[PDB]
Amino acid sequence: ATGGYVQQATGQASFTMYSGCGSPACGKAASGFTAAINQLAFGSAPGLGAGDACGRCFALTGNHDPYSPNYTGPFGQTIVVKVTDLCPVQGNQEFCGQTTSNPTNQHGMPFHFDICEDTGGSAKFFPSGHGALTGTFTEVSCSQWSGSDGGQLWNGACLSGETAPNWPSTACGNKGTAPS
Numbered sequence: 001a002t003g004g005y006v007q008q009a010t011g012q013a014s015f016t017m018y019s020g021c022g023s024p025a026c027g028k029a030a031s032g033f034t035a036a037i038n039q040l041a042f043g044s045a046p047g048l049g050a051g052d053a054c055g056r057c058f059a060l061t062g063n064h065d066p067y068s069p070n071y072t073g074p075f076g077q078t079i080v081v082k083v084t085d086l087c088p089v090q091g092n093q094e095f096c097g098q099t100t101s102n103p104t105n106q107h108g109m110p111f112h113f114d115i116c117e118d119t120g121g122s123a124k125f126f127p128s129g130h131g132a133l134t135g136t137f138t139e140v141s142c143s144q145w146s147g148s149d150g151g152q153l154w155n156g157a158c159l160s161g162e163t164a165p166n167w168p169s170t171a172c173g174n175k176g177t178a179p180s
C-alpha cells in the first residue's frame with residue numbers, strides 16, 4: 001500500500017492482550033472489542049496519527065499456542081474487533097517488529113493483533129492460561145462488530161475505515177513510510 005505498508009484483508013497473525021486502550025493511536029476509542037495492529041499494517045508511525053487500518057473490522061481466530069506447542073485446545077471464540085490502535089515496532093520486537101526488510105515477527109507471523117482487555121475482547125478470545133496465540137484473520141464488514149465509537153480526542157482522529165470496502169482501498173489513509 002502507499003508508504004510501503006503491508007495491508008492485506010486476510011492472513012496469518014499472532015495475538016496478545018494489552019491494557020489501557022482509552023487514548024489510542026487512531027484518536028478515537030470505541031466501546032466494543034478493539035485491537036491494536038502492528039505498525040507495518042497500521043499505516044502510520046508513533047506521533048503521526050491515524051493510519052489506514054483505523055476503524056476496519058476483522059474476525060480473529062486462534063489455533064496454536066506457540067509457548068505450549070503440545071496444547072491442542074480448546075482455544076477461544078472467534079471475535080470481531082475494530083482496529084483503533086498501533087502496536088509499534090519500538091518496544092515490541094517479538095510480536096510487532098515486522099518491517100519491509102523482514103516482514104515477519106519472531107513467531108513467523110506477518111501481522112499481529114494486540115487485543116484490548118478493558119472492553120472484554122481478550123476474555124472471549126484467549127482461553128485461561130494462554131495469553132498469546134497464533135492463527136488467522138479476515139477483514140469483515142463492521143456490520144459484524146458491536147459497539148459505538150467514542151469522541152475525537154484530537155484533530156485528525158479517524159475511524160473512517162469502519163465504512164470502507166475491504167483492503168485494497170483507502171479510508172483514513174497512510175502516513176509516512178513503513179519501517180525498513
Ligand SMILES: OC[C@H]1O[C@@H](O[C@H]2[C@H](O)[C@@H](O)[C@H](O[C@H]3[C@H](O)[C@@H](O)[C@H](O[C@H]4[C@H](O)[C@@H](O)[C@H](O[C@H]5[C@H](O)[C@@H](O)[C@H](O)O[C@@H]5CO)O[C@@H]4CO)O[C@@H]3CO)O[C@@H]2CO)[C@H](O)[C@@H](O)[C@@H]1O
Pocket residue numbers: 015016017018019065067068070071087091092093094095096114129130131132
Ligand atoms: O508486545 C506485544 C504486547 O505484549 C503483551 O504481553 C504479552 C507478551 O508479549 C507475551 O510474551 C506473553 O506471553 C505469555 C503468555 O500469555 C502465557 O500464556 C504463556 O504462558 C505459558 C508459560 O510461560 C509456560 O510456563 C507454560 O508451560 C506449561 C505447559 O503449557 C504445560 O504443557 C506443561 O505441562 O507445564 C508447563 C509449565 O507448567 O505454558 C503457558 C501457556 O502456554 O507465557 C507467555 C510468555 O510469558 O503474553 C503477554 C500478554 O498477551 C503486552 O501485555 C502488551 O502491552 C504488548 O503490547
